[PDB]
Amino acid sequence: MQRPGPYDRPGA
Amino acid sequence: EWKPDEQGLQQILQLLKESQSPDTTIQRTVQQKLEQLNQYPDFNNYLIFVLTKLKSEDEPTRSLSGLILKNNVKAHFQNFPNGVTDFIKSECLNNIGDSSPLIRATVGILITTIASKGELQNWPDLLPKLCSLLDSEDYNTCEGAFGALQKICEDSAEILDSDVLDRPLNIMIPKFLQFFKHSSPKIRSHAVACVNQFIISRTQALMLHIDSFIENLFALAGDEEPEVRKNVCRALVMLLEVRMDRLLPHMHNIVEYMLQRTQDQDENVALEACEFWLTLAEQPICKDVLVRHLPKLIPVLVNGMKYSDIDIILLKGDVEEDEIDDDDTISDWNLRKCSAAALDVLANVYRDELLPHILPLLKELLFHHEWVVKESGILVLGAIAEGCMQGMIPYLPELIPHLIQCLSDKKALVRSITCWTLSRYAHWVVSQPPDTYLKPLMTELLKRILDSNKRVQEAACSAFATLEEEACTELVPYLAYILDTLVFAFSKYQHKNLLILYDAIGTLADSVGHHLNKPEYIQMLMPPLIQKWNMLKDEDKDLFPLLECLSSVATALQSGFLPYCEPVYQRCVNLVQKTLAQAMLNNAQPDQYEAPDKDFMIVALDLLSGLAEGLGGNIEQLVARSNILTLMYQCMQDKMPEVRQSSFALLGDLTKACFQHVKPCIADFMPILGTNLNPEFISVCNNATWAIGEISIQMGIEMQPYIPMVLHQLVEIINRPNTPKTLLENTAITIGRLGYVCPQEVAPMLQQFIRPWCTSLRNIRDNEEKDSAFRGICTMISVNPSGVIQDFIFFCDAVASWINPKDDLRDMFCKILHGFKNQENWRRFSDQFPLPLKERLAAF
């Protein structure tokens, strides 16, 4: 749902 | 005892030597020779022999022999004879302390994989052996024993926690703790690494000793060794999440030490430390324990949000401006990601209270001349946005223009992070007069959608999609430019960015709605979409987003989509059909046919339901000419919840229009629909209720038999307060619709559902669904007033939730209110509400 971000953890 | 024969041994050694050749053909051929010789019963035994007895052989050859023995174990251990298995076990335990660290590492993994492949009860003496061997006077045996022990604990924590081998941990945990004192740093690192595996499991052998554990852990805190500090930080993170009570008395000192570690010179130690801030911010006590440390913590976290030199080099940010492995490397978690996330959650918990600490830093970073510092400042301003918006607003009139300038900065990284930050402030931007901030923002964002740099393109598309979601109808005057640039993007983009471009276009359709239905927009947007649709084959996974995008377009365009409907529709059917066919084939013979990807039929049903929704009655002449009905029936017969959900959605849409062709299949649908309802697969149950509502309101009074079988299930659903609000609201809506079309079966049940029915439907905004549901409840009360005597307050609340309803609905409410005020009570009920609602009741 939520868009890519700069502090996204791999394996959202 | 066992012995090798000399020529066989020598041939095996020659193969191991040749395995080190750079020639891939030599590698392949000797791998083939080895795969053949694996047939020999004692081949693996010669292999361990080379690893262990031929100390004279060079260490690379020995190491590779061990590694390939490990592979043979993982593949074939279950068919090894007992003799060679015993030889392997005994011999590798005899050489666990060999001098070379490489040999000792290979033996460690060999022992670990032997123990993991078999059950520990297949090698019961292993743990006592390793425990007793830790007490070695020789260093190397001790070190190898502890290493293999660490690997075993990491791979096999649960089996060790089981009764398997009589609670071994009850002796091991005291042993490991005793070795926190050991002189060698490597041994201490192994000890903490082993103990850490049993914190999150809350293993009794450890939780019986947490006092000693934390005492020795603090005694160990001052270690020089980076590995020891890494593992100590990891242990404290886990203990915070689990046994927080014990850490709490020492929380001030732990916080100070962990901040010191957050500033550690080693990047791994720093990362482990940052995990502490993330996990602490999740504990309820954080907003009371950490406040005193904010002025020392925020500057650290902020300072950690700069790129490392390695990231700058990998990102090529150093280069002037006049791939997949790059992403692999960048994306991976690191100090920058973790610091930013920690600051984000700290913002969420402290809100305006955190602003006076960070803002003086931020107003220095934002206008710094070093581009790395400016970039970190942009990231800081974007991170705290979500939690700190209410206190940040006064500065947005000053910051947003400068961010809009930064969207034109020379460095690509600055541009991308600026896009993301402006996305974070999209809502406030939209709240302002459009010409002042929104129009400049979207102009610059669209100019960046066509940026030279691909990550800038991705950031721009994400930011613009979020901005569209905030803007909604505000976009419409600029829609020509939005469409022009996006359809141009199709002519430029590449597959990795094309899916986020689909996200942008689908969001545009969703947010703009029917305003998108103009001939110029249609003939501008559709040709490229159908070009991609013709390009993709049915098997292409890239087809999922496209259809997921196209559905939105199809609904937004409503009847304007009609010229492009038929070829889409047809294909959309075939897809699901295919997936059904293979699926049942796979069910008949799983070896002959693999299970097909359910996503194709799921997205096909979604697109087809949206297409029916958009086109209304115009889709009748297609569904009449299709097997579609049977197919979706099977989709709701399928056990998988997603396809059931999608098929019930399609049933509801084909019931909104073209019900006349669905009707003969109701006798087949209704039993399984009602049966599927109650088990409450949340989304599936929700769509099932909604479909029942549609089909009931379509059927009318003729629905006689299908009401008993669904009504009991529905009131059972209403009996469950654990139901999510959407599901319960739709349950109440459909209860009302059923009460409208077929009151006689619903007559007993008013007392059971009226209260939650009120409390749910009071928060839905007066649409036809609510209209028909209230019509139903009015019918029900007219049929049985006795069922609501003790609940008229809820009826009054529900009726008051309507804001200026239709005249006939208003009259129904009015007449029934003037009914049960006669049939004091009505005055007292109306007195329960504030002035607006009571006034509405009086006016009615």
Q: How far is B296 from B562, CA to CA, in rounded Å? A: 63
Non-local CB neighbours of B226 within 8 Å, separated by 6+ positions: B264, B266, B268, B269
Cβ contact, residue pair B503, A3, below 8 Å:
yes
CA A10 and chain centroid, separation: 7
The structure tokens listed for B333 are 């978690």
CA B458 and chain centroid, separation: 20
Q: What is the CA radius of gyration of chain B?
A: 35
- Which positions in chain A touch B382 (Cβ < 8 Å)? 6
Q: How far is B109 from B470, CA to CA, in rounded Å? A: 54
Q: How close is the nearest chain A Cα to the Cα of B501, in Å?
A: 12
Task: Let me know the angle formed at the C-alpha of B382 by B380 and B386, rounded to the nearest 5 degrees.
Answer: 115
- Which positions in chain B touch A5 (Cβ < 8 Å)? 420
Amino acid at position B308, single letter? S
Question: B12 phi and psi, to 5 degrees?
Answer: -65, -40
Q: How far is B487 from B490, CA to CA, in rounded Å? A: 5
Non-local CB neighbours of B367 within 8 Å, separated by 6+ positions: B374
Of B773, B831, B832, the closest CA to residue B802 belongs to: B773
CB atoms inside a 10 Å sphere around CB B544 = 17
Cβ contact, residue pair B340, A6, below 8 Å:
yes
Of B769, B822, B776, the closest CA to residue B795 belongs to: B776
Whether residue B556 contacts residue B512, with contact meaning beta carbons closer than 8 Å, is answered with yes
Q: How far is CA B288 from CA B150, B248, B284, in A?
A: 37, 12, 9
- Widest CA span of chain A, in angstroms? 16
Whether residue B618 contacts residue B653, with contact meaning beta carbons closer than 8 Å, is answered with no
Q: How far is B300 from B569, CA to CA, in rounded Å? A: 57
In B, minimum Cα distance to A1 occurs at B503
Non-local CB neighbours of B724 within 8 Å, separated by 6+ positions: B682
Of B771, B462, B140, the closest CA to residue A2 belongs to: B462
B508 touches chain A (CB under 8 A): no
B502 touches chain A (CB under 8 A): no
Whether residue B653 contacts residue B612, with contact meaning beta carbons closer than 8 Å, is answered with yes
Whether residue B253 contacts residue B293, with contact meaning beta carbons closer than 8 Å, is answered with no
Instruction: For chain A, give the residues followed by a break (C–N over 2.5 Å).
Output: none
Give chain A's contact residues with B (Cβ, < 8 Å).
3-10
Crossing angle of the two packed helices B666-677 and B641-656, in degrees rounded to 10: 130
Q: How close is the nearest chain A Cα to the Cα of B551, in Å?
A: 16
Residue B218 buriedness (CB in 10 A; 0-12 / 13-18 / 19+): middle
The structure tokens listed for B69 are 């023995």
- Which positions in chain B touch A4 (Cβ < 8 Å)? 458, 462, 500
The conformation of residue B179, written as its DSSP 8-state character, comes to G
Whether residue B631 contacts residue B580, with contact meaning beta carbons closer than 8 Å, is answered with yes
In B, minimum Cα distance to A5 occurs at B420
In A, minimum Cα distance to B345 occurs at A7
Q: How far is CA B842 from CA B789, B807, B825, in A?
A: 20, 15, 13
Q: How close is the nearest chain A Cα to the Cα of B613, in Å?
A: 23
Crossing angle of the two packed helices B682-699 and B706-718, in degrees rounded to 10: 140
Of B333, B417, B503, nearest to A6 by CB-CB distance is: B417
Length of chain A: 12
Element containing residue B681 per DSSP (H, E): none
Is residue B269 classed as helix, strand or coil in its secondary structure?
helix
Non-local CB neighbours of B494 within 8 Å, separated by 6+ positions: B454
Cβ contact, residue pair A6, B333, below 8 Å:
no
Non-local CB neighbours of B304 within 8 Å, separated by 6+ positions: B262, B270, B274, B335, B336, B338, B339
Whether residue B389 contacts residue B428, with contact meaning beta carbons closer than 8 Å, is answered with yes
B302 touches chain A (CB under 8 A): no
Is residue B80 classed as helix, strand or coil in its secondary structure?
coil
Q: How close is the nearest chain B Cα to the Cα of A7, in Å?
A: 4
3-state secondary structure B290-309: CHHHHHHHHHHHHHHCCCCH
Q: How close is the nearest chain A Cα to the Cα of B692, in Å?
A: 28
The runs of H, that is alpha helices, within B38-163 are 43-52, 59-76, 82-94, 101-117, 126-134, 139-155, 157-161
CB atoms inside a 10 Å sphere around CB B341 = 23
The runs of H, that is alpha helices, within B678-767 are 682-699, 706-718, 725-741, 743-746, 750-761
- Which positions in chain A touch B458 (Cβ < 8 Å)? 4
Q: How was this structure determined?
A: cryo-EM
Non-local CB neighbours of B17 within 8 Å, separated by 6+ positions: B61
The structure tokens listed for B386 are 């979500």
Of B602, B508, B488, B606, the closest CA to residue B557 belongs to: B508
The structure tokens listed for B637 are 């017969």
DSSP string covering B517-580: --HHHHHHHHHHHHHHHHHS-TT-TTHHHHHHHHHHHHHHHGGGGGGGHHHHHHHHHHHHHHHH
CB atoms inside a 10 Å sphere around CB B601 = 28
Q: How far is B159 from B117, CA to CA, in rounded Å? A: 12
Of B419, B511, B514, the closest CA to residue B471 belongs to: B511
Which residue of B333, B461, B499, B502 is the best one to mutate when testing the A interface, meaning the one whose CB has the most A CBs within 10 A? B333
Return contacts of B31-39, CB within 8 angstroms, 24+ apart: B34/B68, B37/B12, B38/B72, B38/B76
Q: How far is B470 from B465, CA to CA, in rounded Å? A: 9
Cβ contact, residue pair B340, A7, below 8 Å:
yes
3-state secondary structure B592-631: CCCCCCHHHHHHHHHHHHHHHHHHHHHHHHHHCCCCHHHH
B503 touches chain A (CB under 8 A): yes
Buried-exposed string B389-402: b where 16+ CB fall within 10 A, e elsewhere: bebbeeebeebbee
Whether residue B277 contacts residue B315, with contact meaning beta carbons closer than 8 Å, is answered with no
Amino acid at position B670, single letter? M
Which residue of A1, A3, A9 is the best one to mutate when testing the B interface, meaning the one whose CB has the most B CBs within 10 A? A3
CA B48 and chain centroid, separation: 45
Cβ contact, residue pair A6, B466, below 8 Å:
no
B residues 323..342 contacting A (CB < 8 A): 331-333, 336-338, 340-341
CA B363, B364, B369, B375 torsion: positive or negative? negative
Cβ contact, residue pair A7, B465, below 8 Å:
no
Of B376, B383, B274, the closest CA to residue B335 belongs to: B274
Beta-carbon contacts below 8 Å between A and B: 30
Non-local CB neighbours of B302 within 8 Å, separated by 6+ positions: B339, B343, B358, B361, B365, B376, B380
Q: How close is the nearest chain B Cα to the Cα of A1, in Å?
A: 10
Q: How far is B533 from B305, CA to CA, in rounded Å? A: 42
In the numeric block, the tokens 């579609």 are attached to B628
Q: How far is B441 from B439, CA to CA, in rounded Å? A: 5
Whether residue B124 contacts residue B85, with contact meaning beta carbons closer than 8 Å, is answered with no
Of B333, B420, B465, nearest to A10 by CB-CB distance is: B333
B227 touches chain A (CB under 8 A): no
Whether residue B124 contacts residue B165, with contact meaning beta carbons closer than 8 Å, is answered with yes
The structure tokens listed for B36 are 């053949």
Q: How far is B305 from B248, CA to CA, in rounded Å? A: 28
Q: How far is B152 from B411, CA to CA, in rounded Å? A: 48
CB atoms inside a 10 Å sphere around CB B828 = 10
Instruction: For chain B, give the residues followed by a break (C–N over 2.5 Å).
Output: 322, 823
- Which positions in chain A touch B279 (Cβ < 8 Å)? none
B684 touches chain A (CB under 8 A): no
Non-local CB neighbours of B533 within 8 Å, separated by 6+ positions: B546, B550, B568
Element containing residue B32 per DSSP (H, E): helix B24-37
Whether residue B784 contacts residue B747, with contact meaning beta carbons closer than 8 Å, is answered with yes
The structure tokens listed for B615 are 């086109």
Of B640, B642, B503, B619, the closest CA to residue B572 belongs to: B619
CA atoms within 13 Å, Cβ hemisphere of B495: 7
DSSP string covering B353-382: GGHHHHHHHHHHHTT-SSHHHHHHHHHHHH
Q: How far is B565 from B615, CA to CA, in rounded Å? A: 9
In A, minimum Cα distance to B467 occurs at A3
Length of chain B: 844
Residue B253 buriedness (CB in 10 A; 0-12 / 13-18 / 19+): exposed
Q: How far is B761 from B834, CA to CA, in rounded Å? A: 19
The conformation of residue B657, written as its DSSP 8-state character, comes to S
- Which positions in chain A touch B385 (Cβ < 8 Å)? none
- Which positions in chain A touch B344 (Cβ < 8 Å)? 7
CA atoms within 13 Å, Cβ hemisphere of B138: 11
In the numeric block, the tokens 């430019």 are attached to B481
Cβ contact, residue pair A6, B331, below 8 Å:
no
Cβ contact, residue pair A6, B337, below 8 Å:
yes
Amino acid at position B148, single letter? A
Crossing angle of the two packed helices B267-282 and B226-242, in degrees rounded to 10: 10
Q: How close is the nearest chain B Cα to the Cα of A12, in Å?
A: 11
